[PDB]
Symmetry: C3
């Protein structure tokens, strides 16, 4: 079909880690699916000792919201760069074909907006990210990425073609941050975004992040903001990393079905302990909970997880199953 002859629909985005309401399998034919995002540059507190980032975001969040369409839909995005921002921006969709992912067609200075349409002709989770000429890595590592999910029109399938469902989807964006320090050994705090640029590029070139965070801060997905589920529920965990490799793992769980390269026309792998998201990609895992409790979902470079920030929690309600795991003898003195 010709996109100019198709019906249009408008989607209201939601903030991560939620994903906007959508169908899995659908009876709908292809549509032009309209979205809007507004860029917001802002200073953000990223850890528990007051460190700040001169951040750059789509729609005020790290990651930007997840956009969901079905294969054969057209994505039509209006990208807005308000006059209160300092820098030019654009967007590169890995799900799109041509013009550097759309980056060449979406160059917006502060005070400007643009609208891009592209055919979502390949199923999968795909990164989108800013890519302004001459300062591409800086905008990405400062927060400008998220995920486009293009579902098969018949929903997700296992390697034999059997249907797979999820009850809840969550989106996790992992961000390798490069916060400079001064000669006093303290992280720098900058009054403006432009002031932070040359110091940050120097840290970037060391390839050693100061922090690695989920969803914008150490501990973002913990406490009141933990992910939630129940025994018997199947969750889809979408994981994006626009710049650097990561290795997701659910402590005390598994990836039941995982597309680590994130492309749903390929058969998934089952029973994974840890999977691998290549820098510059998004992947997806399904898991059905069988035990209650508080799980950790983390990057299994455990230094990156526990020392630098790349870890969250999932609080799961339900009945403990002693067939799967039982404490036979609690900790007690060693017999002599």
């Amino acid at each position: 079909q010709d996109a100019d002859k198709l019906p249009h629909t408008k989607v209201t985005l939601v903030a991560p880690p939620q994903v906007h309401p959508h169908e899995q399998a659908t009876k709908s034919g292809p549509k032009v699916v309209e979205f809007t995002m507004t860029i917001e540059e802002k200073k953000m507190v990223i850890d528990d000792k007051g460190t700040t980032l001169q951040a750059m975001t789509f729609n005020g969040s790290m990651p930007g919201p997840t956009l969901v369409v079905h294969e054969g839909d057209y994505v039509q995005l209006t990208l807005v760069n308000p006059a209160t921002n300092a820098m030019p921006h654009n967007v590169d969709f890995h799900g799109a074909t041509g013009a550097l992912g759309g980056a060449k067609l979406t160059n917006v200075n502060p005070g400007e907006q643009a609208t891009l349409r592209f055919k979502a002709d390949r199923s999968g989770t795909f990164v989108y990210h800013a890519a302004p000429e001459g300062m591409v890595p800086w905008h990405v590592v400062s927060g400008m990425s998220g995920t486009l999910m293009v579902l098969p029109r018949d929903g997700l399938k296992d390697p034999q073609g059997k249907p797979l469902h999820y009850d809840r989807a969550y989106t996790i964006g992992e961000f390798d941050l490069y916060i400079p320090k001064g000669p006093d050994g303290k992280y720098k705090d900058y009054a403006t975004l432009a002031e932070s640029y040359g110091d940050t590029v120097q840290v970037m070139r060391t390839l050693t992040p100061s922090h690695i965070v989920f969803n914008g801060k150490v501990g973002a997905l913990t406490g009141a903001n933990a992910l939630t589920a129940k025994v018997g529920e199947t969750v889809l965990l979408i994981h994006s990393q626009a710049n650097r490799d990561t290795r997701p793992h659910l402590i005390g769980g598994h990836g039941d079905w995982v597309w680590e390269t994130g492309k749903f026309a390929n058969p998934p792998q089952r029973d994974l302990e840890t999977w691998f998201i290549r820098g510059g990609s998004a992947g997806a895992a399904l898991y059905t909970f069988k035990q209650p409790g508080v799980y950790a979902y983390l990057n299994h470079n455990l230094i990156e997880a526990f020392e630098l920030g790349a870890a969250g929690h999932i609080k799961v309600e339900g009945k403990w199953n002693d067939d799967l795991m039982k404490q036979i003898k609690a900790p007690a003195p060693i017999p002599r």
Copy 2:
């Protein structure tokens, strides 16, 4: 089946790089398979210039021993933390479901033991490692990991379902070490384990290991301690890395059949030159030797292998095959 109604069997563990005797395909029904491991904290010499590590081990070795069961068995582990140790420990099995892999059910202070049972309901090689609250990466990088192998009850299979066998299994645990240096540029030697903690965490956060070793020391699997095989024999090479990515390679060989993500319900890949073990996982490769000689088995970041320690040897007996490789002209002067 209900584990409380099943027969029990006890396994005697052996030290790496060997793997305790086991069946591949079996006619046995499911069992409760009992194991015991005793934690040993100890100072270890890890290189040829006298550098020491304040190490932490399962059963006195790096890696801990490999535990082998079949899918549908229950693993029942007694974990002992003698009063001669300084730190609390526990164990997280990636092969297990619930309670942070069993970590929440196995918290043993010095002087204590505990017994955990879990269903091994997924086939594959899976990491196990210590994970005490608040100091998880330190115990892992100090030596506390090994592998659980859960074999399919019908043995290993290729992508078309044809049977695959091994004649010998070897287990290789690769350890990224973070040994601090003092202001004199020498590696530090500590009188106690606790003394080493804060200096080590600082090195860990740089994400740059001082050493990367197989099986506890530079050169551990060389000389008298080389792996061995013969032409015509098929070996299974189990490779674990609980914290950091690695890329195994057999110089002058291949991975005939490789499960790089380590999960036997997925079809393996064939003819690999180099495979990839995600940090936080164990994988497995089969190879049938066709040429005699001394092979190297290494991490193919060659700096990590040759400069930092991530390399071993395999000495293979048998008849040279000129059909596979022949020296046509030995080194000699260039003609003019």
Copy 3:
């Protein structure tokens, strides 16, 4: 067949990024395919601010040329080390079986040559690299690697066994470089190759490259030296990394069919955004261009690409397709 009873053919190599003329599917039976390469040590300018590398090359280029054979052929290489070089060299073929990949049979001092034959019995892209005893990583990171491609005799196939073709092949070798700096913060320039050794090894052990380049220099595959193609053409992109992981990506394109582990008896994955080449391997991707313009082909650690050098261009001729991507509204003032 017995190689001594087969017909011989001689191939004239070409310089990267081209690949010598070859058939995909062939009616030919197996042959002994003869090649010659001459080692050249030379100082090379690797960036736009005059930094030099004391380099080591096969046939004067980084990477060495790509050698193409079909499965069941024998590769017969004459390796020449002229008396104008300073160091001993050899070659390790990951496509070969035995004698450390051929390294033990090809030890050539300056003034010597040797000839090696091996059976190419496994299909795929395979790294070859120098591996002289005691200085293996130094020769590799200084430039001594390239690719052997062993095509299936029936050409490339998709996961269902349907034929796949390419119209043009390009070879990209990615090199992590370790250029020392002096106490003045400037990169060192050395008068001889041997002078550079101890300083370079120290940088290598930090695991942080100073530069990461395609094909021997920052910008090597840009400007007049950009790759080229047309809409409707299918290209094969061969990517080698002998020492360190990389994550190839085509901006505004995809990997239509990708063998990321590089072994053609395994089914490829489709629709990839970014793929993963393990250090010590070569992989291959097919893409059919659908839009004209200048694409970037890069390592999607964007710091590694844009700050350190791991990026090239592909200039593609043809007709823009608004069905795939259209600018609906060009950048303009935000409405109030």
